[PDB]
Paper text:
Type VII secretion systems (T7SSs), also referred to as ESAT-6 secretion (ESX) systems, are AAA+-dependent molecular machines that are found in the Actinomycetota phylum and have gained great attention due to their implications in cell homeo­stasis and host–pathogen interactions in mycobacteria. Among them, ESX-5 is found almost exclusively in slow-growing pathogenic mycobacteria, where it participates in nutrient uptake, intracellular colonization and modulation of the immune response during infection through the secretion of a large family of protein effectors: the PE and PPE proteins. EccC is a pivotal component of the pore complex, providing the secretion driving force via the hydrolysis of ATP. In the ESX-2 to ESX-5 systems, EccC consists of two N-terminal transmembrane (TM) helices connected to two additional helices (the stalk region) and a domain of unknown function (EccCDUF), which are followed by three FtsK/SpoIIIE AAA+ ATPase domains, here referred to as D1, D2 and D3.
Here, the crystal structure of the MtbEccC5 DUF domain is reported at 2.05 Å resolution, which reveals a nucleotide-free structure with degenerated cis-acting and trans-acting elements involved in ATP binding and hydrolysis. The core structure consists of a six-stranded parallel β-sheet (β5–β1–β4–β3–β2–β2′) further extended by an additional two-stranded antiparallel sheet (β6–β7). The proposed ATP-binding site should be located at the N-terminus of the α1 helix and the C-terminus of the β3 strand, which are expected to contain the P-loop and the Walker B motif, respectively. Altogether, this points to variations of G2 and G3 as structural factors responsible for the extended α1 helix observed in . Inspection of the Walker B motif also shows conformational deviations in , which include a shorter β3–α3 loop and a hydrophobic residue (Val329) replacing the catalytic base.
Numbering used by the authors: 124 to 166, 166A, 166B, 166C, 199 to 274, 284 to 310, 316 to 417
The structure:
């Protein structure tokens, strides 16, 4: 019963700090049996005047079915959703299964990720696409095009593209990069031209997207419909989760 036990797999992201160190942390497995591997909660099903009468179920995206997602909206709500996605993944998946990278011309917003092992380089926070491409050359060398979803190859890489830079094209083509999912925050045309990858916000925090099948993640309509009332994690909530995970790692 996935809807009955949804709080064990996809809870509200501000509950994750208190749950750090529980047996649900880093429990996801790329074994072909865990259908939540590579899945991340983005929000809830209730919205507007219907919030009080709709049984709220989590809404999610799979990292394995698209080479990227493009978050289109106002700066703060786009950052809030990205922080919720990062916190969800850092809690549910171990850094041996999911690694993370941020490429941003706004470093002040990403200082909190210094506590997460997922961003540790064997810190994967870069200020330009050129610096990122030099540091991550070994990641991209020999990698083919993205193949949408047996055992999943690991680590999967989640990259936050937060810099409007024409050099993005020379790193991520239309075919995508195998084992990587980008999340664009800029709203530039190269990311937003594919409709099945767009998450369009409205001022209330509701996102619309092409609906997908609940079991296969396959797109089921070519027009955008309600997708989720997004989860929003503030800098303080994200830093609280990140520091709590860091203290668990030191203990």
């Amino acid at each position: 019963s996935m809807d009955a036990n949804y709080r064990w797999f996809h809870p509200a992201p501000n509950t994750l700090a208190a749950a750090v160190g529980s047996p649900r942390m880093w429990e996801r497995k790329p074994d072909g049996k865990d259908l939540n591997f590579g899945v991340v909660r983005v929000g809830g099903s209730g919205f507007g005047r219907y919030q009080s009468v709709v049984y709220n179920l989590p809404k999610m995206v799979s990292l394995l079915v698209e080479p990227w997602y493009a978050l289109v909206g106002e700066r703060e709500q786009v950052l809030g959703l990205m922080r919720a996605i990062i916190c969800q993944l850092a809690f549910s998946h171990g850094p041996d299964h999911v690694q993370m990278i941020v490429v941003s011309s706004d470093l002040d917003q990403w200082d909190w990720v210094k506590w997460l092992p997922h961003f540790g380089d064997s810190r994967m926070v870069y200020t330009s696409v050129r610096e990122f491409a030099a540091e991550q050359a070994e990641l991209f060398a020999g990698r083919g095009s993205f193949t949408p979803r047996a055992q999943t190859p690991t680590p999967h890489t989640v990259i936050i593209a937060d810099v409007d830079d024409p050099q993005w094209e020379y790193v991520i083509s239309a075919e995508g990069v195998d084992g990587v999912t980008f999340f664009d925050l800029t709203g530039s045309s190269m990311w937003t031209d594919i409709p099945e990858r767009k998450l369009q916000f409205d001022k209330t925090g509701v996102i619309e997207a092409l609906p997908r099948d609940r079991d296969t993640w396959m797109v089921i309509d070519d027009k955008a419909w309600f997708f989720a009332l997004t989860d929003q994690v503030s800098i303080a909530e994200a830093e609280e989760f990140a520091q709590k995970l860091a203290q668990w790692r030191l203990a």
